[PDB]
């Protein structure tokens, strides 16, 4: 969906210490929202290992069962390269999948 | 640095832009300490001849490392061994206040 | 939600009787035109000695503001503003007088911006209202704005931002900022 | 009481809350959605810290799943403010330096500030309870000024510092209130003799890189003096760019042209703006050096002038380090009569208290009657009132000791004093000559129970801001007709104190 964090009183020149500010959050229905405010002075010390939605998808896409961007050597490898198993009564079948990790050994 | 890498034949040497600013949103007036070095994997070698003491102008600055000075340092003048070596830059800037001090670095 | 509204009027000699009448009448109008749900009103008059002219209990049992405000006199003392405030936060916002927890807590400081003889400073009693969480509306009077250091005394009293909280008494549109801040609150 | 137009320190709501992180919040999206969007508006409060507040969020709905957000930026500031810059690992019972930077982002308006370092019994400062430490200064629009403040961490742990700056003919004030960590050393092993009677009666059932010699000397011909520094490095090869942070004794400034003369100097450089800065509040100076030597003394010196007249003057400070490393620094403080420029305090095994308040209760007032005399003697604070004779005197750099001969116990208090007893009263070296005190003279004295140095029976006495002392002549030294009025009020003070005792 969508999650947005913006100010809810645009009619302010510059926030002042001690003052109340109206924060407009837009978001997915029924969701629980987890917040933080950080002194950006922290990031002057360290900004490695910070969380991004795209780092999140990196993790998920890294986890994909497929191991090839494209086709395979034959009918079978197209399936297995994609993370699929094909098996028919006639005997044509995907090779065996014997490893949880992708087939480059020592990679 | 102007370009993310170091071009071996760039006659300019290397031009560097220093941006220094307060957290709240205002620009800083001061003076800088610029030191560079080389990293070979886990092996880092410091480059002492290149340190430049340089002013900082209304939240903006330019520094220039002339190719002449650059090449005088090098140990083995030109070889394939040099490739695979990356550069790191440590910056120490002091305010006009003399009080607050920041260590900064561009590596890789 | 729960609207707890407190009222703090200066009674010092610097308050000319006309300023004072305006105060009492403006408060009564403020409450009257704040005729609306779940708002509670309490009042104390402050000078060199203090006297709470009505508490919240006494108000939930007596809704007529005009009945609450008529008997009020001027004190003609010194001006212990800072001390008056701990009397507001420590007493008026006590459960014992009617104070409800998790209520919208507002203090209406009505003075000319001249504290004098007060043994207390603001650095203890203002951060107190903020650690207790009372939104502070200030109403300067007479020549509360002639001087420079008076009107800044007001922003010192008023919570930030002072442009949204500091108002003159004769101005009739001091309520609508707050009257409205509740309509979806 | 010169000028009536400033906001009272007593009404200066400081900046208080400086979390390095907060709002760990968790809020739920109940709003009726429009466009498929529930919208939430959480009215909050803005901390007393001036920085842009970055806001990071994550929406965990069970139907669509997780969702990071676009961080939100709330830009916070005031036109004029302070930020205070401290170290972290300071050491209890060691004089240190802090720097306070007031920024002014008003575009065209200069400012005059009266700013007080605020008093704290956990710190040996220049600020006693009653004797404020207010510095007056001026600021060019769109510029900030560095203010030094040298102190002693008297205690351990989380100590907060406060400074409240107020302005004239304008609106705002501000105050910084910031904690850090104080810690102990533990050595107490400096050149001890084998049995120095250090032990009590009732118990039991550092510049490693740098040479730095700084001495401030005076001038030949307001007042101008010489600053002298003398520096070196301890290593095998000479060292890289070294830096000096130098700060001005309260109300001081260097000689603008000798400053210029030195900057053209070899191996040295000070940019133009910190060199053509204005004489108005030119207060902190930074000088950078090309290299520093490991082989011999390379000194420097230059002039300092007195811009404002105040009787008491913060030590100057000089902090030197290699360009790369701040933490292996070396700091010296200067003062012309204070050797190594250190504040007077009073020290036992691991405790110290600040001895820098007025020497004794102020003398020479028009009023010297029995009426006020008794009033300051009938107060409850007065634990003891004695009359002794200046018997012996230990003079020294630190303090100057007056050995007092109690013959009579006029009013003992929380003290167990025997008749014909010899007890030790102290007076700081800064005070000695102001007292005009001579041995062999009788003295009638009084103080408080709090003003007792030590624990029984190895105790001492301290003359403080409110201690009262006065010499007592002999019988052959009061018969003069000129000296009548003194010895009159002495006789009537005594008898009415004696006969009546204290009222209560
Ligand atoms: C060590 O002795 C010197 C005087 O010889 C004194 O200045 C210094 O304070 C002493 N240090 C400690 C830790 O006692
Ligand atoms: Mg008054």
* H or E segment to which residue D359 belongs: none
Residue D467's contacts (CB-CB under 8 Å, 6 or more residues apart) are D360, D361, D445, D446, D447, D448, D451
Residue B100's contacts (CB-CB under 8 Å, 6 or more residues apart) are B94, D85, D101
- Chains near D with 3+ CB pairs less than 8 A apart are A, B, C
Q: Which residues line ligand 1 (CB under 6 A)?
A: D 187, 190
Q: Which of D230, D233, D204, D232 shows the shortest CA–CA distance to D215?
A: D230
Q: Please say whether the dihedral angle defined by the alpha carbons of residues C71, C77, C79 and C84, taken in this order, is positive or negative.
A: negative
CB atoms within 10 A of CB D342: 17
Where are the strands (E) in D362-432, listed by range? Answer: 382-394, 399-406, 408-411, 421-428
Q: Does A14 touch chain C (CB under 8 A)?
A: no
Taking the C-alpha atoms of residue B2 and residue B17, their distance in angstroms, rounded to an integer, is: 7
| Chain C residues close to A19, C-beta within 8 Å | 159-161
Taking the C-alpha atoms of residue D411 and residue D415, their distance in angstroms, rounded to an integer, is: 9
Burial D185-199 (b: 16+ CB within 10 A, else e): eeeeeeeeeeeeeee
For a ligand 1 pocket test, name from D190, D333, D341 the mutation site with the most ligand atoms within 8 angstroms of its C-beta: D190
Helix (H, G, I), strand (E, B) or coil at C157: helix
Taking the C-alpha atoms of residue D157 and residue D153, their distance in angstroms, rounded to an integer, is: 10
Chains D and C touch (3+ CB pairs under 8 A): yes
Nearest-5° angle of CA B2, CA B5, CA B10?
A: 70
Domain span including residue C166? 1-185
- Reported for D431-435, long-range contacts at CB under 8 A and 24+ positions apart, including other chains, are D431/D359, D431/D360, D431/D400, D431/D463, D432/D395, D432/D400, D434/D359, D435/D359, D435/D360, D435/D469
Helix (H, G, I), strand (E, B) or coil at D75: strand
Residues in chain D: 504
Q: Could you give the count of Cα atoms lying within 13 Å of D34 in the half-sphere of its Cβ?
A: 2
Cis omega (within 30 of 0) for bond into C161:
yes
Q: Which of C74, C106, C113 shows the shortest CA–CA distance to C174?
A: C106
Q: Do the beta carbons of residue C158 and residue C166 sit within 8 Å?
A: yes
- Closest chain B residue by Cα to residue A46: B104
Distance to chain C for A39, nearest Cα, Å: 21
Taking the C-alpha atoms of residue D428 and residue D398, their distance in angstroms, rounded to an integer, is: 7
Taking the C-alpha atoms of residue C147 and residue D328, their distance in angstroms, rounded to an integer, is: 52
The structure tokens listed for D419 are 């008749």
What are the distances in angstroms from CA D241 to CA B37, B51, B90, D238, D320?
17, 9, 14, 10, 11
Tokens 């019972």 sit on residue? D93
Q: Does C156 touch chain D (CB under 8 A)?
A: yes
Q: Strand pairing partners for D90?
A: D182
- Candidate from D10, D16, D171 with C-beta closest to C127: D16
The structure tokens listed for D309 are 């007249």
Q: Does C159 touch chain A (CB under 8 A)?
A: yes
Q: Does D172 touch chain C (CB under 8 A)?
A: yes
CB atoms within 10 A of CB D127: 21
Ligand 1 atom at minimum distance from D185 CA: 13
The structure tokens listed for D210 are 């740098």
Which ligand lies nearest to the CA atom of residue D190 in the structure? 1
Q: Does B50 touch chain D (CB under 8 A)?
A: no
CB contact under 8 A, A40 and D51: yes
Cis omega (within 30 of 0) for bond into D457:
yes
Q: What is the DSSP string of A44-79?
A: HH--TT---HHHHHHHHHHT-S---SS--SSHHHHH
Taking the C-alpha atoms of residue C116 and residue C84, their distance in angstroms, rounded to an integer, is: 12
CB contact under 8 A, C159 and A18: yes
The C residues from 95 to 154 touching A (CB cutoff 8 Å) are: 130, 135
Q: Which of D363, D433, D343 shows the shortest CA–CA distance to D94?
A: D343
Which ligand lies nearest to the CA atom of residue C47 in the structure? 2
Domain span including residue A57? 1-62
Pairing type for strands D460-462 and D421-428 reads: parallel
Atom 9 of ligand 1: nearest residue by CA position: D190
Tokens 């007031």 sit on residue? D102
Chains B and C touch (3+ CB pairs under 8 A): no
Q: Could you give the count of Cα atoms lying within 13 Å of D148 in the half-sphere of its Cβ?
A: 27
What are the distances in angstroms from CA B52 to CA B27, B37, C168, D242, D272?
22, 13, 59, 13, 17
Nearest-5° angle of CA C120, CA C121, CA C127?
A: 115
CB atoms within 10 A of CB D77: 20
Residue A79's contacts (CB-CB under 8 Å, 6 or more residues apart) are A72, A85, A86, A94
* H or E segment to which residue A20 belongs: strand A20-21
Q: Do the beta carbons of residue D171 and residue C148 sit within 8 Å?
A: yes
Q: Do the beta carbons of residue C105 and residue C147 sit within 8 Å?
A: no
Tokens 């809704």 sit on residue? C63
Taking the C-alpha atoms of residue D191 and residue D198, their distance in angstroms, rounded to an integer, is: 13
Helix (H, G, I), strand (E, B) or coil at A21: strand
Q: Could you give the count of Cα atoms lying within 13 Å of B20 in the half-sphere of its Cβ?
A: 27
Tokens 């965990």 sit on residue? D60
Q: Do the beta carbons of residue A32 and residue D26 sit within 8 Å?
A: yes
Taking the C-alpha atoms of residue D77 and residue D48, their distance in angstroms, rounded to an integer, is: 10
Q: What is the DSSP string of D85-110?
A: E--SEEESSS-EEEEEEEEE--SS--
Q: Do the beta carbons of residue D252 and residue D305 sit within 8 Å?
A: yes
- Candidate from D52, D85, D324 with C-beta closest to B100: D85
The A residues from 30 to 69 touching B (CB cutoff 8 Å) are: 39-41, 44
Count Cβ atoms within 10 A of the Cβ of residue C14 and give its class: 0-12 exposed, 13-18 middle, 19 or more buried. Answer: buried
Domain span including residue D167? 9-14+80-183
Q: Does C184 touch chain D (CB under 8 A)?
A: no
Sheet of strand C39-46: strand arrangement? C51-54, C39-46, C3-10, C104-110, C135-140, C166-168
Q: Do the beta carbons of residue D151 and residue D123 sit within 8 Å?
A: yes
Count Cβ atoms within 10 A of the Cβ of residue C129 and give its class: 0-12 exposed, 13-18 middle, 19 or more buried. Answer: buried
Distance (angstroms) between ligand 2 centre and the Cα of C51 equals 16
- A&D contacts, CB < 8 Å: 191
Residue B66's contacts (CB-CB under 8 Å, 6 or more residues apart) are B13
* H or E segment to which residue D372 belongs: helix D370-378
Chains C and A touch (3+ CB pairs under 8 A): yes
Q: Please say whether the dihedral angle defined by the alpha carbons of residues C25, C27, C33 and C35, taken in this order, is positive or negative.
A: negative
Estimate the crossing angle of helix C122-132 against helix C148-157, to 10 degrees: 40
CB contact under 8 A, D59 and A22: no
Atom 11 of ligand 1: nearest residue by CA position: D190
Tokens 């904690």 sit on residue? D179
CATH number at residue D125: 2.60.40.10
Q: Do the beta carbons of residue A95 and residue A80 sit within 8 Å?
A: yes
Helix (H, G, I), strand (E, B) or coil at C144: coil
Give the best residue of A16, A17, A21, A22 to mutate against chain C (max C CB count within 10 A): A16
Q: What is residue C3's DSSP assignment?
A: E
Taking the C-alpha atoms of residue A68 and residue B62, their distance in angstroms, rounded to an integer, is: 47
- Closest chain B residue by Cα to residue A17: B24
CB contact under 8 A, D171 and C155: yes
Q: Which of B24, B3, B19, B7 shows the shortest CA–CA distance to B62?
A: B19
Taking the C-alpha atoms of residue D78 and residue D81, their distance in angstroms, rounded to an integer, is: 6
The structure tokens listed for D28 are 């739920």
Helix (H, G, I), strand (E, B) or coil at C88: helix
Ligand 1 atom at minimum distance from D187 CA: 13
Count Cβ atoms within 10 A of the Cβ of residue D384 and give its class: 0-12 exposed, 13-18 middle, 19 or more buried. Answer: buried
């Amino acid at each position: 969906g969508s999650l947005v964090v913006k100010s809810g009183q645009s009619e302010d020149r510059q926030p002042v210490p001690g003052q109340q500010m109206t924060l407009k959050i837009e978001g997915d229905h029924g969701a629980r929202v987890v917040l933080v405010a950080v002194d950006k002075g922290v990031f002057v010390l360290n900004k490695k290992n910070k969380l991004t939605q795209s780092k999140i998808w990196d993790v998920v896409e890294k986890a994909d069962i497929g191991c090839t961007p494209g086709s395979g050597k034959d009918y079978a490898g197209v399936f297995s390269d994609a993370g699929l198993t094909f098996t028919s009564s006639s005997g044509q079948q995907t090779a065996q999948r014997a490893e949880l990790q992708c087939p480059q050994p020592a990679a | 640095p102007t370009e993310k890498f170091y071009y071996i034949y760039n006659e300019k040497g290397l031009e560097v832009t220093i941006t220094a600013r307060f957290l709240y949103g205002k620009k800083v007036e001061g003076t800088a300490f610029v030191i560079f070095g080389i990293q070979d994997g886990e092996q880092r070698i410091s480059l002492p001849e290149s340190l430049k003491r340089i002013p900082i102008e209304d939240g903006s600055g330019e520094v220039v490392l002339s190719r002449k000075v650059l090449l005088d340092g090098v140990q083995n003048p030109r070889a394939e061994d040099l490739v695979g070596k990356s550069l790191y830059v440590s910056a120490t800037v002091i305010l006009h206040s003399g009080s607050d001090m920041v260590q900064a670095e561009r590596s890789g | 939600e729960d609207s707890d509204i407190a009222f703090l009027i200066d009674g010092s000699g610097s308050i000319i009787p006309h300023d004072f009448r305006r105060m009492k009448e403006f408060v009564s109008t403020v409450m009257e035109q704040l005729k609306k749900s779940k708002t509670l009103f309490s009042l104390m008059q402050y000078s060199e000695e203090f006297r709470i002219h009505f508490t919240f209990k006494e108000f939930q049992n007596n809704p007529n503001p005009r009945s609450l405000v008529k008997p009020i006199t001027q004190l003609l003392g010194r001006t212990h503003t800072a001390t008056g405030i701990r009397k507001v936060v420590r007493e008026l916002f006590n459960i014992t007088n009617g104070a409800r927890k998790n209520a919208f807590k507002i203090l209406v400081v009505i003075t000319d911006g001249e504290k004098f003889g007060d043994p207390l400073g603001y650095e203890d009693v203002i951060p107190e209202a903020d650690r207790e969480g009372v939104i502070r509306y200030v109403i300067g009077v007479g020549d509360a704005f002639r001087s420079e250091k008076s009107r800044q005394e007001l922003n010192t009293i008023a919570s930030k931002p002072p442009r949204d909280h500091v108002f003159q008494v004769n101005n009739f549109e001091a309520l609508k900022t707050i009257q409205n801040q509740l309509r979806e609150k | 009481n010169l000028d009536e137009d400033i906001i009272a320190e007593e009404n200066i709501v400081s900046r208080s809350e400086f979390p390095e992180s907060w709002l760990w919040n968790v809020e739920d999206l109940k709003e009726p959605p429009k466009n498929g969007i529930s919208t939430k508006l959480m009215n909050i409060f803005l901390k007393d810290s001036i920085t842009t507040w970055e806001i990071l969020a994550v929406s965990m709905s069970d139907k669509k799943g997780i969702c990071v957000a676009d961080p939100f930026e709330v830009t916070v500031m005031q036109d004029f403010f302070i930020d205070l810059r401290l170290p972290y690992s300071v050491v209890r019972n060691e004089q240190v330096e802090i720097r306070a930077v007031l920024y002014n982002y008003r575009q065209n308006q200069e400012l005059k500030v009266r700013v007080e370092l605020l008093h704290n019994p956990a710190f040996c400062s220049l600020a006693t309870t009653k004797r404020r430490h207010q510095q007056t200064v001026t600021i060019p629009p769109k510029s900030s000024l560095s203010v030094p403040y040298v102190i002693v961490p008297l205690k351990t742990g989380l100590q907060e510092v406060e400074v409240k700056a107020a302005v004239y003919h304008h609106f705002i004030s501000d105050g910084v209130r910031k904690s850090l960590k104080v810690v102990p050393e533990g050595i107490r092993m400096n050149k001890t003799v084998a049995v120095r009677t250090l032990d009590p009666e009732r118990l039991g059932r550092t510049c490693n890189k740098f040479d730095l010699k700084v001495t401030i000397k005076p001038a030949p011909e307001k007042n101008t003096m010489i600053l002298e520094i003398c520096t070196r490095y301890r290593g095998d090869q000479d060292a890289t760019m070294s830096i000096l942070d130098i700060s001005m004794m309260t109300g001081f400034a260097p000689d603008t042209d000798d400053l210029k003369q030195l900057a053209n100097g070899v191996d040295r450089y000070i940019s133009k703006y910190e060199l053509d800065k204005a004489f108005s509040d030119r207060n902190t100076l930074i000088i950078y050096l090309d290299k520093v030597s490991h082989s011999e003394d390379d000194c420097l010196a230059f002039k300092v002038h007195q811009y404002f007249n105040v009787e008491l003057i913060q030590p100057g400070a000089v902090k030197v380090y290699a360009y790369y490393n701040l933490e292996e620094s070396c700091t010296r403080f200067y003062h012309p009569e204070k050797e190594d420029g250190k504040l007077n305090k009073l020290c036992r095994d691991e405790l110290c208290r600040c001895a820098e308040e007025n020497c004794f209760i102020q003398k020479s007032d028009d009023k010297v009657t029995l009426e006020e005399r008794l009033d300051k003697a009938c107060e409850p604070g007065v634990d003891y009132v004695y009359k002794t004779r200046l018997v012996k005197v230990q003079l020294s750099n630190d303090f100057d000791e007056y050995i007092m001969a109690i013959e009579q116990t006029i009013k003992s208090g929380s003290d167990e004093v025997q008749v014909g007893q010899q007890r030790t009263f102290i007076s700081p070296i800064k005070c000695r000559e102001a007292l005009k005190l001579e041995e062999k003279k009788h003295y009638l004295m009084w103080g408080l129970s709090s003003d007792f140095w030590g624990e029984k029976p190895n105790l001492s006495y301290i003359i403080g801001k409110d201690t009262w002392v006065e010499h007592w002549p002999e019988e052959d030294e009061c018969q003069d007709e000129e000296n009548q009025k003194q010895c009159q009020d002495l006789g009537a003070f005594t008898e009415s104190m004696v006969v009546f005792g204290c009222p209560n």
